[PDB]
């Protein structure tokens, strides 16, 4: 039969891919990085606590400068904070209270947010009238929006509840490109240091690497066992990390198709909600559902510290472009900035 | 005011004004009570939402605002989404109650309704939210029972050995078979309700007809009991 023949061909192709990956498996990452000195203990203390959200926080994003920040809460609020002085610069109410994502334009002139409504709203910050307006409202998705990341002042990539991600055109409001390769809900995406490729993690335990200009998939990585809730790109742009519902963070490489290392522990049984890398990329910070965050030595899979105590499930985690501070927001109404001590 | 420039005090004043506006918004937010409506394609939740919207007055969500006894209720109904609920339902972990509409007169898909109730009740994040159960379409169920063509024992083999409990206060003027069937259907859901509730959250079984004007009062009373139990648990009384 044609159906059975196609399934057999697919199985043959998968076997060939696995055989090639095994052929390229010269030595493990853990074996190579074993004589390097361990980091030790990474003790980070809270410097600022930002209050003013009436409900759980779902998203957060630093500006290109390492000072201003934006956060989204399901009471229907988008609050911009000056982290140095804890001041509130803007407080934008939203048409829909259910907001699951938040973005900050690299130029600092725009913000974006989406949620259960299948609409991405872009708000203009620099107006001659002194108030923040709704610059654009992009519609066309048929599911809740999980993530959105700005490319320029006139381009943005969004991932929604359906299996598709889309690159839009803010000036015209129409999807310039559609990717439509996944099988489950896409939950996160990460832009490369040069914005030509980007990865997407979904609920089929697989990650996909797409080329923005051509709108096609390049590689598919499958090492996890459950839904992937977060993704972060390595600082050098040649690897990434994924966190899933199972208590595991997996590091995947690009030039070598296969997977590099696994970060897991016997005592951890909850899921990972967010991941991030430091400026050097040596440390990998992951927030968990047990109201905690862990710092893993990404080159040795050794836990080097715990950011402990947020009173509710940690939702979002980010690192400044300068690498000076780590911002963490949870299902509690608060956002905490953490920094090291000399 | 110490070591603060003339342009920093004004920024602090702007932040304080923003904070006072946030306080007013918090008061308004605490004033209203939020509910989450759930049902299948045959549940009939559209009729309930219409009757409680018009009388008491593409998009991924629908909002209905009503007011009973000077109390403001905000019901949220999911629409134009996919069939996988395991990801976007965790948003509704702070609602006051989950209204759950079940078509009782549909024996074939009753097991699906039981499975949905089981998955909602035992969820990790929805384990402290009470469920208001509306067993819609009682007239159709009574008509089907009176017809006698379809037997509940075919789908649930334990119905043949089930007898209606004594002192169950049957409605005067109702057929004994209809009362037995209704009590069995409510029994099937209260088993899941009391299987692992442990008193943290409770379920309120209700019977609803095709055109009933008392649904708002039922929701109001169930919400009153929910808030009363929450307040009792706060003071460690119970």
């Amino acid at each position, epitope marked *: 039969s044609e159906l059975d023949q196609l399934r057999q061909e697919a199985e043959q192709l998968k076997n060939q891919i696995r055989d090639a990956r095994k052929a390229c498996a010269d030595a493990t990452l853990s074996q190579i990085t074993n004589n390097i000195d361990p980091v030790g203990r990474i003790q980070m203390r809270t410097r600022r606590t930002l209050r003013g959200h009436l409900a759980k926080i779902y998203a957060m994003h630093w500006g290109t400068d390492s*000072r*201003l920040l934006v956060s989204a809460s399901q009471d229907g609020k988008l609050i911009i904070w*000056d982290s140095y002085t804890t*001041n509130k*610069v*803007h407080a934008i109410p939203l048409r829909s209270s259910w907001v699951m994502t938040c973005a900050y334009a690299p130029s*600092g002139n725009y913000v974006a947010c989406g949620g259960l409504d299948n609409i991405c709203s872009i708000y203009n910050l620099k107006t*001659r*009238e*002194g*108030n923040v307006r709704v610059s654009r409202e992009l519609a066309g998705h048929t599911g809740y929006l999980s993530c959105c990341r700005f490319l320029d002042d006139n381009q943005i990539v969004t991932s929604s509840g359906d299996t598709t991600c889309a690159l839009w055109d803010i000036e015209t409001g129409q999807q310039t490109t559609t990717f439509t390769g996944h099988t489950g809900d896409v939950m996160s995406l990460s832009l490369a240091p040069d914005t030509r490729l980007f990865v997407s993690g979904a609920c089929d335990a697989s990650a996909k690497l797409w080329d923005v200009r051509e709108g096609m998939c390049r590689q598919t990585f499958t090492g996890h066992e459950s839904d992937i809730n977060a993704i972060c790109f390595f600082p050098n742009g040649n690897a990434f990390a994924t966190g899933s519902d199972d208590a595991t963070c997996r590091l995947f490489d690009l030039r070598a198709d296969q997977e590099l290392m696994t970060y897991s522990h016997d005592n951890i049984i909850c899921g990972i909600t967010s991941v991030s890398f430091s400026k050097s990329g040596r440390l990998l910070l992951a927030g968990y559902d047990d109201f905690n965050c862990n710092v893993w030595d990404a080159l040795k899979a050794d836990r080097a510290g715990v950011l402990a105590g947020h009173d509710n499930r940690v939702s979002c985690l980010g690192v400044t472009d300068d690498g000076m501070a780590v911002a963490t927001g949870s299902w509690d109404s608060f956002l905490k900035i953490w920094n090291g001590s000399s | 005011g110490c*070591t603060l*420039s*003339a*342009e*920093d*005090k*004004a*920024a602090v*004043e*702007r932040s304080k*004004m923003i904070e006072k506006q946030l306080q007013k918004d918090k008061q308004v937010y605490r004033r209203t009570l939020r509910l989450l409506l759930l049902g299948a394609d045959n549940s009939g939740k559209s009729t309930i939402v219409k009757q409680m919207r018009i009388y008491h007055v593409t998009s991924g969500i629908f909002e209905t605002k009503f007011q009973v006894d000077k109390v403001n209720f905000h019901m949220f109904d999911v629409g134009a989404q996919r069939d996988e609920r395991r990801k976007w339902i965790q948003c509704f972990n702070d609602v006051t109650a989950i209204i759950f509409v079940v078509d009782s007169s549909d024996y074939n898909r009753l097991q699906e309704a039981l499975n949905d109730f089981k998955s909602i009740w035992n969820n990790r994040w929805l384990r402290t939210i009470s469920v208001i159960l509306f067993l819609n379409k009682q007239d159709l169920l009574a008509e089907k029972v009176l017809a006698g063509k379809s037997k509940i024992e075919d789908y649930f083999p334990e119905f043949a050995r089930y007898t209606t409990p004594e002192d169950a206060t049957p409605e005067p003027g109702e057929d004994p078979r209809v009362t037995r069937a209704k009590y069995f259907i409510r029994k099937e859901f209260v088993d899941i309700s009391t299987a692992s509730g442990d008193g943290r959250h409770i379920c309120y079984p209700h019977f609803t007809c095709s055109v009933d004007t008392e649904n708002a009062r039922r929701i109001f009373n169930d919400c009153k009991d929910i808030i009363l139990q929450m307040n009792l648990r706060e003071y460690n009384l119970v």
Partner: single-chain antibody
Amino acid sequence: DVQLVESGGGLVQPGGSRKLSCSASGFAFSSFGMHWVRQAPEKGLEWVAYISSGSGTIYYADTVKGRFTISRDDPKNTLFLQMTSLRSEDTAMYYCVRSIYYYGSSPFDFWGQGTTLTVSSGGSDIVMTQATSSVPVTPGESVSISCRSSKSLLHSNGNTYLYWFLQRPGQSPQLLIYRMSNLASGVPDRFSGSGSGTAFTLTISRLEAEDVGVYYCMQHLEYPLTFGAGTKLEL
């Protein structure tokens, strides 16, 4: 678009009372603090009074203190300045200015049209010296303007609070450079600014016929605000 229209000026007897109403249209009035700026027939601008957003804080100049009162009607989008017991030194043109304050804000961005008024018949201050009052230069050549402050304008935040204003003949001043480095919206890249804590320099790379007029220095360190003497650039 954005409009600030003043009214209430006229000829008054000495010792009388007067009121000016500044109507604002086209922007969120309640979110902007407001200033009154007085320009005498003689060269030079002088800050008069300031009221914050929501009227939280009110500031007056040491000269008009005790005789001038500034208030605002947010629902009516109007700013009132009432004066009692006038003198012969208050005959001038009044400009209505708006200013918004946050981290990256641009204060003193828009100025009102201004209304003229004629009358019949210092320790906590920072001075500004603009020695070159008049600089004649053919257009198409670079132009340099110098400003000096008695006190250092650099705060502990690293922000230097210095503002440059352009007044071309017949029109109210418009903000060019704020905080000594940034450029106001709608200002061509010809204008550049720099300077140390005490001395500041503004450069116009390619002069044109539009830039003829007076240039004014200003500070924002301590709330008594002092404008410069004003350097007049002409062909």
